[PDB]
Design a binder for this molecule. Structure first.
Ligand SMILES: CCCCCCCCCCO[C@@H]1O[C@H](CO)[C@@H](O[C@H]2O[C@H](CO)[C@@H](O)[C@H](O)[C@H]2O)[C@H](O)[C@H]1O
Ligand SMILES: CCCCCCCCCCO[C@@H]1O[C@H](CO)[C@@H](O[C@H]2O[C@H](CO)[C@@H](O)[C@H](O)[C@H]2O)[C@H](O)[C@H]1O
Ligand SMILES: CCCCCCCCNC(=N)N
Ligand SMILES: CCCCCCCCNC(=N)N
Ligand SMILES: CCCCCCCCNC(=N)N
Ligand SMILES: CCCCCCCCNC(=N)N
Ligand SMILES: CCCCCCCCNC(=N)N
Ligand SMILES: CCCCCCCCNC(=N)N
Lengths: 104, 90, 104, 89
């Protein structure tokens, strides 16, 4: 069960990331608040999901979902670039992050 | 401009003013307003303070009774609207 | 400059991380203050960098520097095991960061 | 260890000015909790808290001629056992 709320922890990680992009320097009220509470939610669900699951595998999935989701929702909502070079270089960047967190 | 809008003095006193404004639509609300007040035409610099953006009112105390002042309400950025200002005499 | 802000934000991401574990239950004054200052600085610089950069890129690189600096600090200031796997994972990390910076 | 040296630097029949040694650098905590009450019946003790960067505290409202016990607590037990002194106003 702690796997699924770890999934949702990474989902709210994507949530405050997109909410921060909508706030423009943390100046627009409501996206700024979604950023804070969505970050608190992600931290709290993570603390409970890690109480049972391995710390290395929990964080690797938590940041993996948060990073990839921010990349996908970025190119979707804010119409961010979809270059063949950009998709390759972030694939390399995400595997490195997922790898290092899964080894500690 | 966009925000703020309808800046007015709700209540007043020889030494204090109670002002308000319209924050706009929910998508127009902002994190903070910075508020400026000072003697109009005087050789004194203006005083300033910030108020959380989930508020539409603000009080200004310690004013000289009988002097005309000017009060301005700024948004976080000027990208939304230019600051609105009013003149009130205590 | 927005990229420069990202690197510094990732630097303060790891300093509050290891200062948090060196604090106890948020009970030691000096470490708890370093975490709080490190957290606020990391969130402020990240929020400023998101204004001019895509959120999918800003989130991934900001996490990447934090994870990279975490392992760099672990191997040096903690007598952490260095593996061929962790080396190539850091190489994928630095490659993705530089590559994304190179397609600006 | 933390904290230590709980003195009564000043005292009037209705108040006590206490102090303590916080240690240095790596032992400074985020807050201390001070409790004061009559050495005997107590009924309940009176308590308050002070931030960790401070090392003094004032206890007010005491009844003159009553022996009070004053204890100083750290955030957790992993610091060095509580401190406690007795004092008649
Ligand atoms: C819980 C964690 C708390 C997080 C703390 C984050 C603080 C949130 C508000 C930050 O405000 C920023 O300050 C800049 C100034 O330092 C502003 O630049 C502004 O500078 C000029 C002000 O004169 C304006 O005209 C410009 O439009 C504008 O770029 C900028 O807009 C604004 O985003
Ligand atoms: C206390 C309520 C706060 C709740 C909002 C939470 C996040 C905002 C925190 C305050 O933000 C700071 O306030 C300054 C206010 O001074 C602003 O600087 C601005 O104000 C200066 C005033 O001299 C000007 O020069 C410039 O417009 C600019 O630097 C600027 O927004 C920011 O550094
Ligand atoms: C798109 C999410 C990516 C999450 C990373 C994949 C799982 C990592 N766990 C391992 N044991 N290797
Ligand atoms: C909620 C705070 C209430 C307002 C008092 C603080 C105003 C400080 N002025 C600045 N320009 N920062
Ligand atoms: C928990 C809801 C928090 C909503 C914050 C805004 C409040 C009202 N907005 C104003 N401009 N007055
Ligand atoms: C209760 C409404 C906001 C209170 C603001 C008080 C006046 C400004 N403060 C300064 N230090 N200048
Ligand atoms: C209650 C203070 C809120 C400031 C939070 C600072 C950023 C923490 N989140 C990260 N992903 N690093
Ligand atoms: C180009 C050099 C590639 C070196 C790869 C080392 C992999 C070793 N890890 C195992 N689990 N066996």
């Amino acid at each position: 069960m702690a796997w699924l709320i770890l999934i949702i922890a990474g989902i709210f990680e994507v949530v405050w990331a997109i909410a921060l992009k909508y706030s423009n320097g943390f100046t627009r009220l409501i996206p700024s608040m979604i950023t804070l509470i969505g970050m608190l939610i992600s931290f709290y669900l993570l603390s409970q999901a890690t109480k049972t699951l391995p710390i290395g595998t929990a964080y690797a999935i938590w940041t993996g979902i948060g990073a990839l989701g921010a990349v996908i929702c970025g190119i979707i909502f804010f119409k961010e670039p979809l270059t063949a070079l950009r998709i390759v270089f972030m694939i390399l960047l995400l595997t490195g992050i997922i790898g290092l967190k899964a080894t500690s | 401009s966009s925000v703020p809008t309808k800046l007015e003095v709700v209540a007043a006193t020889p030494t204090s003013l109670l002002i308000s404004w319209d924050a706009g639509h929910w998508w127009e609300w902002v994190t903070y307003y910075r508020i400026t007040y000072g003697e109009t035409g005087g050789n004194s610099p203006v005083q300033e303070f910030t108020v959380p953006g989930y508020s539409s009112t603000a009080t200004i105390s310690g004013l000289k009774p009988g002097v005309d002042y000017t009060i301005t309400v700024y948004a976080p950025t000027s990208d939304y609207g230019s600051p609105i200002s009013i003149n009130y005499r205590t």
